[PDB]
């Protein structure tokens, strides 16, 4: 418990959504950090070099989740609870379209320009992006689908289901390569590497899965019954980050030794880790967004290089 | 079909060529098929 996590004067000015922050994310380059929140749903982009917000864009409805397609801030896709998909170019709003049924989560396959919609239907919608035409559907044969993820290493698509079964599909030829069986539904699904996979459950269990073996390599159980929203992987220290509303748990990939735990004042909607840094970004049920720095986990980010001197 | 309840496949003009296919896959195609056959207990 000798980790001495610090909490943050103002690294970025006006890092403050009016009431709450729904989702926090970072770009591939690391130049831009994006956040969305209630009220008057906004998309606010903060430049790391300038330590200020680049722009703020109000939206019609609350955004469940968004994906940064471009390397920079130019191209963003928003999913709405009103079945609305909004595309944003560098200028601003570009186009808006509907999805036949409500969408829980979506993932984009960078090869072939196919974006997959997982929602309140048995079928998982596919939208080709080089040609605007909607592609042929794939039938998952499950009443409700919760989450989806795409493997970067070899392009494998897996969708979570309400029955608790993970079904793996192939983006090429659109056939079901395999299926996995494991009452609680799948809260979070994450791919790490070629061969490692993680399943989150609403009861509060983190199950690490190998693609080749049905049995889980390791299981970690949150004592609270709250579901875990986000599961993240940190390669350098082999630390797996599992986050729920009450607390954030960071533990080792092998043998399940716990690194440290952080409990904030308010519940977390989302958590984010800046690449190759000990800095942690959290979105809370508070106008402020929490910023935490762990010196042990990694060095300070380059744009915040003086933080190491300040400690 | 009302309010876009039923999916329609008309071409979308604004979405045309919105992105370019970019792929970084380390696994060769032969390795993928062998891995896919052996997934889980199969």
């Amino acid at each position: 418990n000798e980790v001495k996590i610090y909490s943050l004067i103002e690294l970025i000015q006006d890092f403050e959504m009016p009431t709450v922050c729904t989702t926090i994310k970072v770009s591939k380059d690391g130049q831009y950090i994006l956040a969305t929140g209630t009220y008057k749903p906004r998309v606010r982009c903060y430049d790391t070099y300038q330590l200020s917000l680049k722009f703020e864009r109000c939206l019609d409805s609350e955004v469940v989740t968004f994906e940064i397609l471009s390397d920079d801030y130019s191209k963003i896709v928003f999913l709405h609870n009103d079945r609305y998909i909004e595309f944003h170019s560098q200028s601003g709003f570009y186009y808006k379209t509907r999805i036949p049924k409500f969408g829980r989560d979506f993932s984009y396959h960078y090869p072939s320009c196919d974006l997959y919609f997982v929602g309140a239907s048995s079928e998982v919608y596919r939208l080709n992006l080089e040609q605007g035409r909607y592609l042929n559907p794939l039938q998952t044969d499950a009443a409700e689908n919760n989450v989806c993820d795409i493997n970067s290493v070899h392009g494998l698509f897996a969708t979570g289901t309400i029955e608790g079964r993970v079904e793996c599909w192939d983006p090429r030829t659109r056939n079901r390569v395999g299926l996995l069986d494991c009452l609680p539904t799948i809260s979070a699904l994450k791919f790490n590497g070629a061969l490692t996979m993680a399943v989150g459950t609403t009861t509060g269990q983190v199950l690490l899965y190998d693609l080749r073996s049905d049995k889980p390599l390791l299981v970690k159980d949150h004592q609270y019954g709250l579901p875990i929203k986000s599961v993240h992987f940190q390669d350098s220290l082999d630390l797996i980050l599992s986050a729920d509303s009450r607390i954030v748990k960071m533990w080792n990939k092998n043998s399940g030794k716990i690194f440290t735990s952080l409990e904030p004042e308010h519940d977390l909607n989302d958590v984010c880790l800046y690449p190759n840094s000990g800095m942690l970004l959290t979105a809370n049920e508070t106008p402020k967004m929490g910023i935490y720095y762990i010196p042990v986990l990694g060095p300070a980010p380059r744009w915040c290089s003086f933080l190491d001197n300040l400690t | 079909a009302s309010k876009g309840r039923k999916l329609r496949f008309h071409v979308l003009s604004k979405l045309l060529s919105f992105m370019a296919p970019i792929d970084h896959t380390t696994m060769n195609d032969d390795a993928r098929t062998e891995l896919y056959r052996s997934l889980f207990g199969q």
């Binding site: 035409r133 592609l135 042929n136 559907p137 090429r172 030829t173 | 079909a1 039923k6 999916l7 329609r8 496949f9 008309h10």
Partner: peptide, 11 residues
Amino acid sequence: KAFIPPKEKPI
């Protein structure tokens, strides 16, 4: 015609 699903071929 508007509801007929397109068929794609593997390249």
